[PDB]
Write a protein that binds this DNA or RNA. Structure first.
Ligand SMILES: [Mn+2]
Ligand SMILES: [Mn+2]
Ligand SMILES: [Mn+2]
Ligand SMILES: [Mn+2]
Ligand SMILES: [Mn+2]
Ligand SMILES: [Mn+2]
Ligand SMILES: [Mn+2]
Ligand SMILES: [Mn+2]
Ligand SMILES: [Mn+2]
Ligand SMILES: [Mn+2]
Ligand SMILES: [Mn+2]
Ligand SMILES: [Mn+2]
Ligand SMILES: [Mn+2]
Lengths: 78, 97, 99, 103, 94, 105, 83, 98
DNA sequence: ATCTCCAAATATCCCTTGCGGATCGTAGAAAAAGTGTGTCAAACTGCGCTATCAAAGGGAAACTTCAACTGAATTCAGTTGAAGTTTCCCTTTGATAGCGCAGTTTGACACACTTTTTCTACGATCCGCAAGGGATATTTGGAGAT
DNA sequence: ATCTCCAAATATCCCTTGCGGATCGTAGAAAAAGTGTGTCAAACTGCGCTATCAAAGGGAAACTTCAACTGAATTCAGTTGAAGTTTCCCTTTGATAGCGCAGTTTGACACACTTTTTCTACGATCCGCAAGGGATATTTGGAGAT
């Protein structure tokens, strides 16, 4: 699944970031870093879901989780 | 006809910094989200916006991280980003011990 | 009827009004409106949040326009803070006029 | 409405209600929702002003998320105020580091 | 005037844990800051959880999920179990 | 057993915690168990820090806990360090630590 | 009497000392003025907020609490001075 | 007459200051700086002495942590010498501005 | 390989202090006990929306070919910051006196809150039409070669 | 520096769909009224903050010498990027299946409130003394020198 985050996709993100040349090892690192980022946010999102006695992870759940990590997101129910 | 190494990559930067479309393919990302959620709680559904939220958050996060990574690369008189660059960025961010 | 399909509530109309006030010939996509609604909510919380603490910090039971003002001074950077304080003071001056 | 008495587009009643339901304090004085509504109005005025122009500059009559991102990040103070916020579908400011460009 | 403080409890818990060990005044001031700080973080998050879920009341449930959100893994496991165990015991009496 | 702490089996003060929750505008109503649960968590976290600072005092041939001991305790512990990641312990100094490249060769 | 140029009381020896605590082995001669610059901004930001807390309370004396509150706002919680 | 090689006393200064916890900036000079800055925001302020001492604790801690990050930036670039550009890199990634 | 020597560490004395353990007398807060009341758990219900299914092409990802140019290694000298010395500035320390002002107190009350009836702003829902999307063409801005 | 060559920018035209205005109905805001308590103004006060002085000496500033660090210069193996070919799977489109979210009604009960009874925790003060912390002397580990 983690390999669905593909080399060309990572390059694309790197390009938005202003990145011209990428070491071959960057792709494995990014995947690692992205796993930890999703784990943390989803850990919190799911805690909210569970607390609400729901089986469905909402946008709000995510937004709240993102707010707790100091990563406030606009566009989904802020 | 051959563009020199770097000329296309420069062009790509211009292209992506001008758009706001997501850059990870939707389904593979969705699969990853459910796999990770599965490891925290079994038998869970997602609002489609929830997944969307996560993708927006995740890419913005990575893009910004690439900006910081690129700076560390350049700090080391380099032009190529390496894991040591990400690792330094993440440490100075205080994301890592 | 009988079963009512909830009821959401946002700032979309007042934003739309202010958009007219400053850009008459300009519109707004729904996604961008969602963003503005978030922005208004976010700021609202950050402000009332400080004011709440100011009241606690000072052993007081009421959130007054005095806590809103200093909350704004703590929350907003230089130029925004100064303008926000003008607009706020002025509205209170005007609102207390009207009887 | 209290908004009219205060010359504001933003709802002074709603802001007032919302300040009573948020458990910020035991009591809310009368001036406080006016002042808040005002500040909220001024700030949203401010964004729309700059977002509008970015729509114009991009030859558009409708503000989209990207114009909000441009408005915000090209403005020093708004950029500061939204330092830890991400605008969905906003992308980034076009920026390429000098040393990456060819001579 | 009275200046409330967690000093006496911190002494007690200190005697339980390291019975022949003292604490300097400044060290206590820090302990006091720590207790007020963690309190603030927990009550804070708990407050939000109730609001998010249209509730008028903070219960040990909000404290619990607040704890899970704020404490790193293991510290959350033990705090949670110390918490549940105290409420369990507390209801057992009256 | 009279006091609510005694009932809950706690050193930390349930009544004080109940009052601080009520007078802090966290919500209109505070449930019976909330300050029990909360006093317990607070007691537990102070036991963990005191324990770990306690040891730091002993490793430095010391009998009385000072802020340096708390600081050593917190930053040598992955979890407390994370929990107090954005906190500064006055008069704590830092961990002894010198990057390799700076060592003599 | 007029207060001027007090950033200079933050001496080279004193900056060298902080850099040592921070594990720094060698220091460029340009570091001292950069550090002053940075310390000044750091103190302007925190002091601005502490003073606002003071003014809100209608007080003329800045307290430890105004500072402790100012620091908490900047996400730099301090332990040892109340709160 | 005896002479330590360059870097030896520097290393021993690191051990010395990493063991201790005392404030490293002189006390009255720091106090004058605080008062000067306060004054530019409001005149006639007085300070609790613990209020100043808190600011000093905060400031020394901030600066000490910033030198740790600065060093990591210097080492990242194969140097052992901290330079303005190291601090600037650190502050940029930290998200500190002005 | 062996000696010299410097500063951090170890040792001795004296002594100040801030700590834990008292005992104290006592405001203020918790507990106890009675009662009024609204929150929310439960149980039953509708249907919004999440999951899923099946198929088919078009474009993305993967893999492959090549060599340009970048990072990594090496070398060296001018630059520069560390170490140590000398002079003496100005911080620290300690006691002093004066008073600006933080914090406690007390009555009079404005102003918020609570409850009830009246009025209306703003949410839900609806869809015509133009701003924007998407496709194809023509102009323009630059890179790579000679 | 000038002439061929892509790819992005611009221009044009026809389709597509969500802006944005309009209709309709209600929940929530405003109006009016009776009640009380947090807030405010004004009086009084002593903690501790500013201010000073004055003696002692630790630490800053300014200086010389030079070891060694930074970084400039040079080389090159090989890792990337660019372009081509190949293999694979994401996305889109039309629903039908039914989970579980969210609406509605309700009454038992848990928590608010307020009063009287009980006792916890704070502020003031004294004590044994081990724990430090400073002033003075010595021993010790190892960096640098012969
Ligand atoms: Mn205009
Ligand atoms: Mn000035
Ligand atoms: Mn004593
Ligand atoms: Mn004592
Ligand atoms: Mn190589
Ligand atoms: Mn058009
Ligand atoms: Mn178009
Ligand atoms: Mn032409
Ligand atoms: Mn041209
Ligand atoms: Mn619309
Ligand atoms: Mn000296
Ligand atoms: Mn069902
Ligand atoms: Mn020896």
């Amino acid at each position: 699944n983690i390999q669905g985050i593909t080399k060309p996709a990572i390059r694309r993100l790197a390009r938005r970031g202003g990145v011209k040349r990428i070491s071959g090892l960057i792709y494995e690192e990014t995947r690692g870093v992205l796993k930890v980022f999703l784990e943390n946010v989803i850990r919190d999102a799911v805690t909210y879901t569970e607390h609400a006695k729901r089986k469905t992870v909402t946008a709000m759940d995510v937004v709240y989780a993102l707010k707790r990590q100091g990563r406030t997101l606009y566009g989904f129910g802020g | 006809h051959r563009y020199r190494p770097g000329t296309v990559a420069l062009r790509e930067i211009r292209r992506y910094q001008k758009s706001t479309e997501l850059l990870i393919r939707k389904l593979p990302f969705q699969r990853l989200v459910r796999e990770i959620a599965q490891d925290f709680k079994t038998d869970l559904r997602f609002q489609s916006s929830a997944v969307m939220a996560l993708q927006e958050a995740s890419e913005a996060y990575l893009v910004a991280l690439f900006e910081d990574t690129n700076l560390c690369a350049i700090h080391a008189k380099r032009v190529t980003i390496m894991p040591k660059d990400i690792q330094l960025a993440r440490r100075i961010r205080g994301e890592r011990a | 009827k009988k079963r009512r399909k909830t009821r959401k509530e946002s700032y979309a109309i007042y934003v739309y009004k202010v958009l007219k006030q400053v850009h008459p010939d300009t519109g707004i996509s729904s996604k961008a409106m969602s963003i503005m609604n978030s922005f208004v909510n976010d700021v609202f919380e950050r402000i009332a949040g400080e004011a709440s603490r100011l009241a606690h910090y000072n052993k007081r039971s009421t959130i007054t326009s005095r806590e809103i003002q200093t909350a704004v001074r703590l929350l907003l950077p230089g130029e925004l803070a100064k303008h926000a304080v003008s607009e706020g003071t002025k509205a209170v001056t005007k609102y207390t006029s009207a009887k | 409405t209290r908004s009219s008495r205060a010359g504001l587009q933003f709802p002074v009643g709603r802001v007032h209600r919302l300040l009573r339901k948020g458990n910020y304090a035991e009591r809310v004085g009368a001036g406080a929702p006016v002042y808040l509504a005002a500040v909220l109005e001024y700030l949203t005025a401010e964004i729309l002003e700059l977002a509008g122009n970015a729509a114009r500059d991009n030859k558009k009559t409708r503000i989209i998320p990207r114009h909000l991102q441009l408005a915000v990040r090209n403005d020093e103070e708004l950029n500061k105020l939204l330092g830890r916020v991400t605008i969905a579908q906003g992308g980034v400011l076009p920026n390429i580091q000098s040393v990456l460009l060819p001579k």
